[PDB]
């Protein structure tokens, strides 16, 4: 339940925040070892 924007815009990185930020790598696939091989 992260908060990456202030109420007036203004993106926040959340570097030290507890909640996991949604970002570019959020939908990266979980690699199957045999498929990778």
């Amino acid at each position: 339940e992260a908060k990456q924007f202030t109420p007036d815009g203004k993106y926040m990185p959340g570097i030290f925040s507890k909640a996991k930020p949604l970002d570019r790598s959020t939908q990266w696939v979980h690699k199957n070892p045999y498929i990778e091989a």
């Binding site: 790598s25 690699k31 498929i35």
Partner: protein, 443 residues
């Protein structure tokens, strides 16, 4: 010329901007490629279509480097100036901006040069830039970079003594006097075939493309597919056909069998590919084989149809690379087995994928349909069977295209969410160009 100096000097000022001003760096590098698009559109406005074949000439004394505009160069220059700001939208560092700015200078000056030594100097000055672009340290591939650089260097080194042979033979490398003098056409013809059969992927010197066009980033793939392959075609149309035409007749069975086996064997290889970017990368070899045979037919309106196929490929295949790049950027894989049901999760991206799939298979209302019809008119007029070979093998292209689309788009919905505004506007100019050039291309 003065305008070109001003555009180069404005483009080179990206390095002097302090890096802490991020917005200014982005805006400056994007505008530095927007301006040449306006200038080339103005050059199209200035062109007299009922006038001379070569217009807007400039020659820089005794330094070679002479320039002029014809129709093929003008269409290719317009396509390059469209493609470069889209590449600017896909980069994030000043090193990338500067590499693509230097590449744009070299491509634009190479497309309209009228000197063979000038063409040699301008084109393969991009070799080290391509090496650094493909073999970038964390996410590139040094093997692919070595392959593309070594194949291009091998071809260029075959050409260079024959270039100097005709230069000692007549006294100039200017194409207007090289076409009017008596020269030993077999030697120079073999040198020119050696460069342009590597630039255009023609078997057997084609193995660099599957590695390089996949290991490149999305901007590099857009540039390499949509632009740099067509320098071989404009090499054929500008330098080799006017200067060594006796060779160009005598080599026709060999060039013909190279084109036929490249088309068939590359189409057969595309069916067994399991990487989406490798699927898109192989399909370009068959299209360039059709381009080369249409150029070499010299039969009805061969320059027109072959240039139109070069433009149609340069519009359609960068968009497929853009869609694969979106999937890779937001899912971190290019492997078909990880993707299914993309219609339910990316409806806009899948619709764009379907439309560009249909365009790549030369269906009507796309410029590839008009292109392939006119290319086969040019091929048919020499003999009917050389056209029949391309006609009967259309099931083989549609097999891989629809198999890749059906495997990644339908099924169980898994994969990333739909496209953003930025991704949609990277795709969008290619779609508008395709709709126009496939419905009302001429007036």
């Amino acid at each position: 010329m003065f305008i070109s100096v001003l555009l180069i000097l404005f483009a080179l000022c990206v390095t002097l901007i302090p890096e802490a001003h991020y917005h200014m760096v982005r805006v400056w590098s994007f505008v530095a490629t927007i301006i040449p698009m306006w200038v080339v559109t103005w050059m199209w406005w200035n062109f007299d279509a009922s006038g001379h074949g070569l217009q807007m000439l400039v020659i820089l004394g005794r330094s070679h480097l002479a320039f002029g505009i014809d129709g093929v160069a003008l269409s290719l220059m317009l396509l390059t100036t469209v493609l470069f700001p889209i590449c600017m939208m896909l980069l994030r560092t000043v090193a990338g901006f500067m590499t693509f700015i230097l590449l744009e200078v070299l491509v634009l000056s190479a497309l309209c040069v009228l000197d063979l030594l000038g063409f040699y100097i301008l084109f393969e000055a991009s070799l080290i830039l391509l090496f650094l672009l493909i073999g970038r340290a964390p996410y590139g591939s040094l093997e692919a970079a070595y392959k593309i650089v070594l194949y291009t260097m091998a071809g260029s080194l075959v050409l260079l003594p024959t270039l100097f042979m005709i230069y000692s033979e007549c006294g100039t490398t200017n194409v207007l006097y090289m076409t009017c003098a008596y020269n030993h056409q077999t030697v120079l013809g073999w040198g020119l075939l050696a460069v342009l059969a590597v630039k255009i992927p023609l078997m057997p010197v084609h193995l660099w493309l599957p590695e390089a066009h996949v290991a490149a980033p999305t901007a590099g793939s857009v540039l390499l597919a949509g632009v740099l392959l067509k320098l071989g075609g404009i090499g054929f149309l500008r330098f080799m056909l006017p200067v060594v035409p006796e060779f160009c007749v005598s080599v026709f069975p060999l060039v013909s069998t190279l084109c036929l086996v490249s088309f068939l064997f590359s189409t057969l290889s595309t069916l067994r590919q399991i990487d989406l970017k490798k699927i898109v990368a192989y399909s370009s070899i068959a299209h360039m084989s059709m381009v080369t045979l249409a150029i070499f037919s010299q039969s009805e309106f061969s320059a027109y149809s072959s240039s139109f196929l070069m433009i149609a490929h340069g519009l359609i295949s960068p968009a497929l690379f853009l869609i694969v790049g979106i999937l890779y950027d937001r899912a971190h894989t290019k492997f078909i087995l990880y993707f299914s049901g993309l219609g339910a999760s990316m409806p806009i991206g899948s619709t764009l994928f379907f439309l560009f799939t249909l365009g790549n298979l030369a269906f009507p209302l796309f410029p590839n349909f008009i292109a392939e019809v006119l290319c086969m008119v040019s091929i048919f007029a020499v003999h009917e069977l050389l056209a029949y070979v391309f006609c009967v093998c259309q099931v083989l292209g549609a097999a891989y295209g629809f198999w890749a689309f059906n495997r990644v788009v339908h099924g169980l919905p898994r994969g990333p969410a739909d496209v953003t505004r930025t991704e949609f506007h990277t795709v969008l100019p290619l779609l508008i160009g395709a709709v126009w050039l496939g419905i009302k291309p001429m007036a």
